[PDB]
Design a protein around this ligand. Structure first.
Ligand SMILES: *C(=N)CC(=O)N(c1ccc(-c2ccccc2)cc1)[C@@H](C(=O)N[C@@H](C)c1ccccc1)c1cccnc1
Ligand SMILES: *C(=N)CC(=O)N(c1ccc(-c2ccccc2)cc1)[C@@H](C(=O)N[C@@H](C)c1ccccc1)c1cccnc1
Lengths: 301, 301
C-alpha cells in the first residue's frame, strides 16, 4: 500500500551530466557517445539577450572557446554545431557510462523524471508533467539550465526535456533533445506568457483509481454519467476533454477496481460541482493531475 | 523559482541493491564491502509468522541456504549472523561500487530518500519523513522489504532506514542499519498500532518560508505572538511543540525573508484557527510538514 510522486532511478543519467562554460556563463550539459548537448543560450551575454542572432554569435566562437568539464576532468572540443536551440559539441572522448538511450518528443499530459543540476553536479530528482500549455511546474534555481527530463524503458533512458528558462509566471520551459521548444516559447528575453493551463482529465481519474486502490473510496457516488454529459462539465472547470482513447487507457485500472470509467467520471462531476468539504484523497485536499494511468499502474503493480 | 518533493540522486545506492532468497521468500538486500544486509524476516515461513523465534529459525539454516543475486551474477555466503532484526551475510566478493557510507539513526522529523526495490531491481525514488510516531507514509508493494532510505552528505551516503513491514493502517515501519526498529514495532504478525501522528511544527514553518520565497505570501498576517501563546495553540491541533532550537534552526530562512520566526508562527496560528478558505500555498490546499528547514534551504539555495 501507499502512493507518492515517485521518480525513476537517476544513476544511468547522473554519469552523463557535465559542466559547460563561456566567459561568465556556465550551465549543465549531457554527454552521450562523442557529443555534448546543452542550451545554445550559453553563448549569449547580458548585452545581447533582448534579441540575439545565434548564427552570428556562434560564428564569433571556435572549438577551443568552450570549457567542457566532467567531474575534475576536461574534454577537447573537435566539432560544434547548432541544432535548433541546442549546441552539439563533438568531443575526442565518448562517455564510457553512455547508457542505451533514445531522444523522444513527449506529449502534453505525459510525465517524466527531472535530474536538477548546478555546475554539472546532479543535485536532486523529482517527477514532472508536460502541462497542456507546454510549460512545467518544476524546481529550478539559477544555473539549472541544461538539466534533463527522462523516462526509463527496460534498460533504455528516453530523454524528452532539456530545461532552458523560467517564465515571469515562475513556470519553466525547454526543448526536446533535437532543440525544439515545447510550446511557442523562444530563447530570448522578451515578454512570453503561458496560455490557459487546463487540467489533465485522464490523470485526475488515474489518481482517483489509485485512491480507491489504497482504500480512500469516500467520494464514490451511486450515480453514473455520459461522456458528452461529463465533457460539458469538464469544459466549465477548464479540463482536458476526455476521449474514448482516454477511456480505453484507463481499462487496466477499471479491470482491477471492478469500476466502469464513466462511474468514476460521475464521481469527478460531483467533486468538481460540490468541492471536497474538507475531506482528503491520498492525503491531498485537491484533485491531482500529474500522474498518468501508466504511472499509477507501475506504483499500484 | 519552483518548489517540489525532491530526492537525492540514487546512483551511488542503485549499485548496492541485490536480491535475497529463502524457499518462497525473496526480498532486496544492501551489499556494502564484504557484507549483505537484509531484514531477518526472510528466514520465516507463513507457518511461523504469528510468533517466530529467530535464534531457533536461524540455527536451522547454514551459509549455502541463502541465494544472494546481484544483476545476473551469484555471490558465495561465507559467514552469517543476526544483528537485532537484520541479517549480516558475509560474501567472498566486496562490492566494487561501494560508496563512502555511514549508518546513522535518524530522529523523528528528519527526511530521507527511499529507493523502492522489487527483486533487487531499483524501481523508483521518493522523499520521506520519519513521522513523530516512528512510522513512514511511503509507497511500498509486496517484495519492497529491504528497500533503503538514505541522505547524501558531500560524497558520503548516510543510510538511515531499511523497510520491513506495512502496518494495518497502511503506513510503514523498519529499522536503522544496526537492525533496531524506529518506534515500538516488532518483526512478527501481531496487532501493532501506530500512536497519535502529530504534525512537525518546524517543518510546516520551513514550508511557509519556502512559500514566501517563491512569492506565495497571502497568509502573512499583521499580528505577532509568543512561543508559549503559540505552543498552547499547537497542542490543540496536535502539533510538535516548537523549541528555541527549532527557532534557531529556522534562522537562515528568517534572515533571507527578513521575517521574524514568531511572526510566521502568528500566521500559522491564523491558518490553524481560520483554515485556508479555498486558497492554496505552493499549490497545496493543506499545511505540509515533510520538508526540514535544511531541505528548504537546499531547494531555495
Ligand atoms: C541557466 N543556467 C541560466 C538560468 O538559470 N536562467 C536563464 C538566464 C538567462 C537566459 C538567457 C539569456 C540570454 C539570452 C537567452 C536566454 C535564460 C535562462 C534563469 C532564467 O531563466 N531567468 C528568466 C527570468 C530569464 C531572463 C532572461 C532571459 C530569459 C529568461 C533561471 C532562473 C530559475 C530557473 N531556471 C532558470
Ligand atoms: C517484503 N518484501 C515482504 C512484504 O512485502 N510484506 C511482509 C510480508 C511478511 C512479513 C513477515 C512474515 C513473517 C514474520 C515476520 C514478518 C513482513 C512483511 C508486506 C507486509 O508487511 N504485510 C503486512 C500486513 C504484514 C503481514 C504479516 C506480518 C507482518 C506484516 C508488505 C506489503 C506492502 C508493503 N510492504 C510490505
Amino acid at each position: 500500500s501507499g502512493f507518492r510522486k515517485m521518480a525513476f532511478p537517476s544513476g544511468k543519467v547522473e554519469g552523463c551530466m557535465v559542466q559547460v562554460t563561456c566567459g561568465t556563463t556556465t550551465l549543465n550539459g549531457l554527454w552521450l557517445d562523442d557529443v555534448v548537448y546543452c542550451p545554445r543560450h550559453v553563448i549569449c551575454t547580458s548585452e545581447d539577450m533582448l534579441n540575439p542572432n545565434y548564427e552570428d554569435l556562434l560564428i564569433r566562437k571556435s572549438n577551443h572557446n568552450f570549457l567542457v568539464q566532467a567531474g575534475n576532468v576536461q574534454l577537447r572540443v573537435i566539432g560544434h554545431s547548432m541544432q535548433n536551440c541546442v549546441l552539439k559539441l563533438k568531443v575526442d572522448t565518448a562517455n564510457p557510462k553512455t547508457p542505451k538511450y533514445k531522444f523522444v518528443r513527449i506529449q502534453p499530459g505525459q510525465t517524466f523524471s527531472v535530474l536538477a543540476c548546478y555546475n554539472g553536479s546532479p543535485s536532486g530528482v523529482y517527477q514532472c508533467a508536460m502541462r497542456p500549455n507546454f510549460t512545467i511546474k518544476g524546481s529550478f534555481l539559477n544555473g539549472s539550465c541544461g538539466s534533463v527530463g527522462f523516462n526509463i524503458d527496460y534498460d533504455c533512458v528516453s530523454f524528452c526535456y532539456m530545461h532552458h528558462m523560467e517564465l515571469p509566471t515562475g513556470v519553466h520551459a525547454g526543448t526536446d533533445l533535437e532543440g525544439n521548444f515545447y510550446g511557442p516559447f523562444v530563447d530570448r528575453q522578451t515578454a512570453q506568457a503561458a496560455g490557459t493551463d487546463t487540467t489533465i482529465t485522464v490523470n485526475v481519474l488515474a489518481w482517483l483509481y489509485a485512491a480507491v486502490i489504497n482504500g480512500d473510496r469516500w467520494f464514490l457516488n451511486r450515480f453514473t454519467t455520459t461522456l458528452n454529459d461529463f465533457n460539458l462539465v469538464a469544459m466549465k472547470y477548464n479540463y482536458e476533454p476526455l476521449t474514448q482513447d482516454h477511456v480505453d487507457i484507463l481499462g487496466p485500472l477499471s479491470a482491477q477496481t471492478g469500476i466502469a470509467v464513466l462511474d468514476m467520471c460521475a464521481s469527478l462531476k460531483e467533486l468538481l460541482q460540490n468541492g471536497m468539504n474538507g475531506r482528503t484523497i491520498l492525503g491531498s485536499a485537491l484533485l491531482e493531475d500529474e500522474f498518468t494511468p501508466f504511472d499509477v499502474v507501475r506504483q499500484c503493480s
